[PDB]
Design a protein around this ligand. Structure first.
Ligand code: EXT
Ligand code: EXT
Ligand code: NA
Ligand code: NA
Ligand code: NA
Lengths: 423, 422
């Protein structure tokens, strides 16, 4: 009676995947086993960045739990070691760290640092995005339903997507998108909000995995900084080497953010987030606020984060993701060329997707067919999902220990699944 | 070079206790060891509710880490088991749960549920309180420095304290305090905010461990509910049996909150928080919001929380805290009677304090002497701290495994420490 018992305690609205919620009882690496003993390839979960049940992570956490686990008002070496290891993954002026317990807490603090620093309130976000679940983040949310109306201090941008657009038309797309940014900024200024931040997921995953014209992000940053604002890269989806080509998603662009936020993978499942920032921004915020987060930077959270970084580094996972990503993209392009139910190939590294469309010549988004594919792939023993404003972009985002053998299983099942659709 | 290295990464403002920061490298139960090998009694930390390095909590976390640790979009028994165990500690209409990763995330979500439900924004809080570190909580914060001005939607209340007041004057204190509440409410209504919530820590610990006249909390609840608002009991300090006499601090008062928040001890250090509420409030919020917290309710966090409740129940810690609390209170009263540097004895269960005052007959708060006593207690091998708007209320709040042998060591050193003052 597990579903009933859940509904009587945490309630029926807390989301569950699939028509029939799956009960997953164990995992190992990329493999998950449900309560009936069926085994699935995990094509979806990024939180277990270094695999389900990774024993190096388990051991590091357990050993620290046998030692001591206190807040950061007493000195302790584990937090300092972890901060050093994490900050060694950043360049330029990104050289200080605030630890938190979630991605929402990180984005909440980043927006607060920015609001205080800039003396402005205005927020630029995409028109189909999600950055967390606090009050301030609800007021800026466009990609999921919330009761709060969109804040008067918010402008939502239509982030440009070159996918399937003729290469001759990109310059007009870029020029128009940037004029839209100018208009947003001028609007926020006229209203008295000014510009505090541009906040974005570098993969634009919730948006449908957009491929941007070169110069868009750089152009936004320039305009935002001319308005006295800051740039925040939300790395919850693109971070920790997920893209292959760089540790952080913002590296796909010619931009250095003042603020970088993170959560998901960082502790393999342990509740940890962070805000990485400049010396000037951390120092200022600390002079103005007696800021403290009780659980942040505790030794056990730090042990978990350290073990994740150590494991990624020892197993060369980021470089592996880059090579495997390229292979997967070539296969997906073959799939797209031949399937009338596939539009464009999207993403990078081990965050990959395809938009699912009607085969009747309309190229219309086909959410229903997308659902069919998600459910059929589950039947075939692979967990995937979807994103995007039309609910038609398959989203594949496995643990970063997913290798070539796993990719061939997933892609072969995807092909067969596509071949089973009608018309 | 540990201090320097910390300052180069997480910076020099992140707070540290004591003139000379202590490096604590290990602990066991109520005992901590610093990098020089000096051993201290923990009289201060409530996060390790069931003791430093508790092996049942460590084992429950590890076994689940070796099993699976996914978000709640897949069914998993651990979260359901935990939710059942936690909700079994609540009566009346408190029968649903939202899990979070901290006490701030819980209070943030509680305010949000209340704002949406009530259609109001006004907040009543104490005038020297701290409920967390988000933007919305910064705007209501009175007991610590933040850059955000106190919100136009906030009214700060002087919570009444009967400590040292003649009994004959308590009813007048109560009456005036409640008129102050009426005035706050009418101001919020005139200004168009209305009343969304009254939010409080039942021990009023940050405020200096106030002893309230009976009927104040009941009276606030009545007035807030007549204005269409809700009551939130923040249990981060008073929860999980700390008070001895009840699982939750709000049980000290004749009040059933609509919202109860928690954090700190819940997972012995593991990052967990919660909002406990009614079926109607959870249902309404879920209909109106696609609310999801990625780490909340993961199997490992639920394993941790379960191990804490199981251990507390198995070792009878709440009932022990009630009996030991009575003994400590008697000892502290003997100490207060004898020392001209001690005013009132405060708190309940294993949250206890004393105000430290000048001995010159003025009874003026003495923050400098309080700091001397904290530093001297540290030299003698006991960790304590202080709270209150005058920074003069010693705060003792040990792991809930602290027993009588520990209380005698602490209280003996405190006596000797008080005897050393001018
Ligand atoms: C971009 C971005 N930024 C911030 C957050 C918030 O993190 P959280 O507080 O939930 O730890 C998410 C979450 N995303 C919740 C949905 O997770 P998924 O379906 O497995 O991708 C986020 O996607
Ligand atoms: C009443 C109350 N409500 C919420 C919070 C916030 O919890 P968090 O987000 O830091 O886990 C605190 C914390 N308080 C941080 C100070 O910790 P202490 O000195 O060891 O008592 C709180 O005191
Ligand atoms: Na760019
Ligand atoms: Na195609
Ligand atoms: Na009362």
């Amino acid at each position: 009676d597990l579903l009933a018992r859940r509904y009587a305690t945490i309630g029926p609205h807390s989301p569950l995947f699939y028509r029939q919620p799956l009960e997953l009882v164990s995992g190992s690496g990329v493999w998950l086993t449900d309560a009936q003993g069926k085994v699935y390839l995990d094509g979806y979960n990024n939180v277990p960045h270094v695999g389900h049940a990774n024993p190096a992570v388990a051991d590091a956490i357990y050993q620290q739990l046998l030692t001591v686990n206190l807040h950061t008002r007493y000195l302790n070496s584990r937090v300092v070691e972890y901060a050093e290891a994490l900050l060694s993954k950043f360049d330029g002026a990104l050289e200080r760290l605030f630890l938190t317990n979630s991605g929402s807490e990180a984005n909440e603090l980043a927006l607060r640092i920015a609001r205080q620093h800039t003396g402005n309130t205005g927020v630029l976000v995409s028109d189909f995005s999600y950055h967390g679940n606090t009050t301030s983040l609800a007021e800026i949310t466009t990609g999921l339903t919330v009761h709060e109306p969109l804040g008067a201090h918010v402008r939502a941008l239509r982030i440009p997507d070159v996918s399937g657009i003729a290469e001759v038309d990109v310059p007009v797309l870029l020029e128009q998108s940037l004029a839209d940014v100018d208009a947003a900024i001028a609007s926020l200024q006229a209203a008295g909000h000014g510009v505090s931040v541009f906040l974005f997921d570098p993969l634009f995953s919730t948006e449908g995995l957009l491929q941007l014209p070169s110069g868009y992000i750089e152009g936004v940053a320039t305009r935002v900084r001319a308005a006295g604002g800051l740039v925040i890269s939300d790395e919850v989806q693109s971070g920790f080497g997920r893209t292959g080509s760089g540790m952080w998603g913002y590296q796909m662009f010619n931009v250095e953010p003042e603020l970088v936020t993170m959560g998901k993978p960082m502790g393999n499942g342990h509740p940890i987030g962070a805000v990485v920032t400049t010396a000037e921004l951390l120092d200022e915020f600390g002079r103005h606020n007696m800021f403290f987060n009780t659980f942040a930077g505790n030794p056990v959270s730090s042990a978990a984060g350290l073990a994740v970084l150590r494991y990624m580094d020892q197993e060369d996972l980021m470089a592996k993701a880059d090579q495997l990503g390229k292979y997967i993209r070539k296969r997906l392009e073959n799939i797209a060329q031949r399937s009338g139910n596939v539009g464009s190939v999207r993403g990078r590294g081990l965050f990959f997707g395809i938009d699912i469309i009607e085969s009747d010549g309309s190229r219309n988004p086909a959410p229903a067919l997308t659902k069919i594919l998600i459910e059929d792939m589950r039947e075939r023993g692979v967990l995937i999902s979807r994103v995007g404003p039309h609910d038609n972009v398959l989203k594949m985002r496995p643990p970063l220990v997913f290798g070539r053998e796993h990719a061939d299983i997933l892609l072969g099942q995807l092909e067969l699944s596509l071949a089973s659709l009608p018309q």
